[PDB]
Design an enzyme around this catalytic site. Structure first.
Site, PDB file in Angstrom:
ATOM      1  N   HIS A  46      -0.175  17.009  -8.965  1.00  0.00           N
ATOM      2  CA  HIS A  46      -0.018  15.579  -8.847  1.00  0.00           C
ATOM      3  C   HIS A  46      -1.349  14.957  -9.007  1.00  0.00           C
ATOM      4  O   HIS A  46      -1.559  14.039  -9.877  1.00  0.00           O
ATOM      5  CB  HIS A  46       0.982  15.224  -7.832  1.00  0.00           C
ATOM      6  CG  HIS A  46       0.987  13.660  -7.579  1.00  0.00           C
ATOM      7  ND1 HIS A  46       2.214  13.054  -8.104  1.00  0.00           N
ATOM      8  CD2 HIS A  46       0.347  12.661  -7.412  1.00  0.00           C
ATOM      9  CE1 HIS A  46       2.087  11.863  -7.917  1.00  0.00           C
ATOM     10  NE2 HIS A  46       1.024  11.488  -7.377  1.00  0.00           N
ATOM     11  N   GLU A  47      -2.129  15.196  -8.047  1.00  0.00           N
ATOM     12  CA  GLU A  47      -3.520  14.692  -7.952  1.00  0.00           C
ATOM     13  C   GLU A  47      -4.451  14.865  -8.972  1.00  0.00           C
ATOM     14  O   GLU A  47      -4.995  14.170  -9.671  1.00  0.00           O
ATOM     15  CB  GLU A  47      -4.066  14.747  -6.749  1.00  0.00           C
ATOM     16  CG  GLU A  47      -3.213  14.592  -5.378  1.00  0.00           C
ATOM     17  CD  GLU A  47      -2.881  13.039  -5.286  1.00  0.00           C
ATOM     18  OE1 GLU A  47      -3.390  12.312  -6.061  1.00  0.00           O
ATOM     19  OE2 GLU A  47      -1.833  12.723  -4.510  1.00  0.00           O
TER      20      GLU A  47
ATOM     21  N   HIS B 278      -3.566  12.979 -11.900  1.00  0.00           N
ATOM     22  CA  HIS B 278      -4.194  11.644 -12.188  1.00  0.00           C
ATOM     23  C   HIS B 278      -5.537  11.507 -12.991  1.00  0.00           C
ATOM     24  O   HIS B 278      -5.972  10.371 -13.608  1.00  0.00           O
ATOM     25  CB  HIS B 278      -4.247  10.933 -10.805  1.00  0.00           C
ATOM     26  CG  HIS B 278      -3.212  10.436 -10.141  1.00  0.00           C
ATOM     27  ND1 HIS B 278      -2.275   9.751 -10.538  1.00  0.00           N
ATOM     28  CD2 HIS B 278      -2.912  10.858  -8.929  1.00  0.00           C
ATOM     29  CE1 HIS B 278      -1.379   9.310  -9.811  1.00  0.00           C
ATOM     30  NE2 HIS B 278      -1.482  10.013  -8.895  1.00  0.00           N
TER      31      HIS B 278
ATOM     32  N   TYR C  98      -3.107   1.214 -12.625  1.00  0.00           N
ATOM     33  CA  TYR C  98      -2.423   1.555 -11.498  1.00  0.00           C
ATOM     34  C   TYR C  98      -1.765   0.452 -10.897  1.00  0.00           C
ATOM     35  O   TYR C  98      -1.976   0.050  -9.746  1.00  0.00           O
ATOM     36  CB  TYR C  98      -3.332   2.287 -10.246  1.00  0.00           C
ATOM     37  CG  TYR C  98      -2.592   3.279  -9.512  1.00  0.00           C
ATOM     38  CD1 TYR C  98      -1.776   4.373 -10.035  1.00  0.00           C
ATOM     39  CD2 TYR C  98      -2.797   3.159  -8.124  1.00  0.00           C
ATOM     40  CE1 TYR C  98      -1.244   5.090  -9.253  1.00  0.00           C
ATOM     41  CE2 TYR C  98      -2.046   3.813  -7.254  1.00  0.00           C
ATOM     42  CZ  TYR C  98      -1.198   5.080  -7.904  1.00  0.00           C
ATOM     43  OH  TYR C  98      -0.531   5.948  -6.973  1.00  0.00           O
TER      44      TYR C  98
ATOM     45  N   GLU D  23       2.253   7.256 -11.840  1.00  0.00           N
ATOM     46  CA  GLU D  23       2.899   7.967 -11.016  1.00  0.00           C
ATOM     47  C   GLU D  23       3.735   9.207 -11.323  1.00  0.00           C
ATOM     48  O   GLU D  23       3.735  10.339 -10.772  1.00  0.00           O
ATOM     49  CB  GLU D  23       3.472   7.210 -10.031  1.00  0.00           C
ATOM     50  CG  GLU D  23       2.481   6.730  -8.573  1.00  0.00           C
ATOM     51  CD  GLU D  23       1.922   7.974  -7.938  1.00  0.00           C
ATOM     52  OE1 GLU D  23       2.548   8.784  -7.476  1.00  0.00           O
ATOM     53  OE2 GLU D  23       0.857   8.294  -8.021  1.00  0.00           O
TER      54      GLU D  23
ATOM     55  N   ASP E 185       2.743  -1.744  -2.547  1.00  0.00           N
ATOM     56  CA  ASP E 185       2.587  -0.489  -3.237  1.00  0.00           C
ATOM     57  C   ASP E 185       2.155  -0.579  -4.555  1.00  0.00           C
ATOM     58  O   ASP E 185       2.536  -0.049  -5.465  1.00  0.00           O
ATOM     59  CB  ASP E 185       3.839   0.457  -3.015  1.00  0.00           C
ATOM     60  CG  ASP E 185       3.697   1.689  -3.562  1.00  0.00           C
ATOM     61  OD1 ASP E 185       2.709   2.413  -3.485  1.00  0.00           O
ATOM     62  OD2 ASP E 185       4.756   2.254  -4.460  1.00  0.00           O
TER      63      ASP E 185
ATOM     64  N   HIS F  13       5.007   3.881  -6.626  1.00  0.00           N
ATOM     65  CA  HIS F  13       5.465   5.263  -6.269  1.00  0.00           C
ATOM     66  C   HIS F  13       7.106   5.020  -5.985  1.00  0.00           C
ATOM     67  O   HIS F  13       7.753   5.720  -5.550  1.00  0.00           O
ATOM     68  CB  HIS F  13       5.193   5.420  -4.680  1.00  0.00           C
ATOM     69  CG  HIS F  13       3.930   5.910  -4.800  1.00  0.00           C
ATOM     70  ND1 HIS F  13       2.548   5.310  -4.438  1.00  0.00           N
ATOM     71  CD2 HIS F  13       3.386   7.336  -5.192  1.00  0.00           C
ATOM     72  CE1 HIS F  13       1.279   6.030  -4.599  1.00  0.00           C
ATOM     73  NE2 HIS F  13       1.856   7.243  -4.853  1.00  0.00           N
TER      74      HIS F  13
HETATM   75 ZN    ZN Z   1      -0.280   9.800  -7.127  1.00  0.00          ZN
END
Ligand code: ZN
Ligand code: CA
Ligand code: CA
Ligand code: CA
Ligand code: CA
EC number: 3.4.24.27
Length: 316
Positions: free
Chosen positions: A142-143, A146, A157, A166, A226, A231
């Site tokens: 996941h990261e 990014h 973002y 995301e 957020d 998310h």
């Molecule tokens: Zn993320």
């Protein structure tokens, strides 16, 4: 650092034994020279100055409890590297074998992990909400993803572009999990979330609403929390992604699933060739449809399934 390549062994956050590529120069460092310009894992030593110190170990054996988060950050970076190379012909996150650096033991009881524009960061969790987040391969991928998005589409973002950002990370996070083929699912973070509770996770792609996330555009969040719900509204795209791969009927709309691999190819092509920093959900639909056309022909099942999927989540 300069040294000779060797291979260490240790246990990860879940107690599993694995070999790791290291570099010997008086100590054995968590430096893998076998992938691109290297994979490098560091100790933040419970503080937040980054990246910390390149992980050094005296005997190339990593079975200490303190070693576990490093073992997994290092290993799953390598798995993620392998996925982008073998499956998408992509050499690291920038496509030119940039060094992948990770820091673990970030802060104290830090219930999170992230990409900071240049590297991976992993907290140890507070032991209740989380255990060391590098234990989750979907979290790691996941990261890292990014990093891939930032170097490709550049999705800003926030708001819809942010929610796409995301979802993209949850999508490939999941595909890398299946690629490693260890307890794979369409949930995110389950390996490291709430050790005291089984069956749960941070999010679900197959049923976002199980954690209060929208699964239709008409249920989208429009507040400013957020960063405008990146998310949260990601559930709408995650759901669509799930449908394309697995199929189903959602609010009465049937989707013919085309499988993980085709999902992977369409969304990668979309990500690297059609999405831009300000893309919204409708724009993502168009990009996905075009990717599938490119890949499979305008009359393909694949293109049709993509349309079905976005239809089912209310995205035109
Ligand atoms: Zn993320
Ligand atoms: Ca050791
Ligand atoms: Ca799993
Ligand atoms: Ca998962
Ligand atoms: Ca749990």
């Amino acid at each position: 650092i300069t040294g000779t390549s060797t291979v260490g062994v240790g246990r990860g956050v879940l107690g599993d034994q694995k070999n790791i590529n290291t570099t010997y120069s008086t100590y054995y460092y968590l430096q893998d020279n076998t992938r691109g310009n290297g994979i490098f894992t560091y100790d933040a030593k419970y503080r937040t100055t980054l990246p910390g110190s390149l992980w050094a170990d005296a005997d190339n054996q990593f079975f200490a409890s303190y070693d576990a988060p490093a073992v997994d950050a290092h290993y799953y970076a390598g798995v993620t590297y392998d996925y982008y190379k073998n499956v998408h012909n992509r050499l690291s996150y920038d496509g030119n074998n940039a060094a992948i650096r990770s820091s673990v033991h970030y802060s104290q009881g830090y219930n999170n992990a992230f990409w900071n524009g240049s590297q991976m960061v992993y907290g140890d969790g507070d032991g209740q909400t989380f255990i060391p987040l590098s234990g989750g391969i979907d979290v790691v991928a996941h990261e890292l993803t990014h990093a891939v998005t930032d170097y490709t589409a550049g999705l800003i973002y926030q708001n819809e572009s942010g929610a796409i950002n995301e979802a993209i990370s949850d999508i490939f996070g999941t595909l890398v999990e299946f690629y490693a083929n260890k307890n794979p699912d369409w949930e995110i973070g389950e390996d490291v979330y709430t050790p005291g509770i089984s069956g749960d996770s941070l999010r679900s792609m197959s049923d976002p609403a199980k954690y209060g996330d929208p699964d239709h555009y008409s249920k989208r969040y429009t507040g400013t929390q957020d960063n405008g719900g990146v998310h949260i509204n990601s559930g709408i795209i995650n759901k669509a992604a799930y449908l394309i791969s697995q199929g189903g009927t959602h609010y009465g709309v049937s989707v013919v699933g085309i499988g993980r691999d085709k999902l992977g190819k369409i969304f990668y092509r979309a990500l690297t060739q059609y999405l831009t920093p300000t893309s919204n959900f409708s724009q993502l639909r168009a990009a996905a449809v075009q990717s599938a056309t490119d890949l499979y022909g305008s009359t393909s099942q694949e293109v049709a399934s993509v349309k079905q999927a976005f239809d089912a989540v209310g995205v035109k």
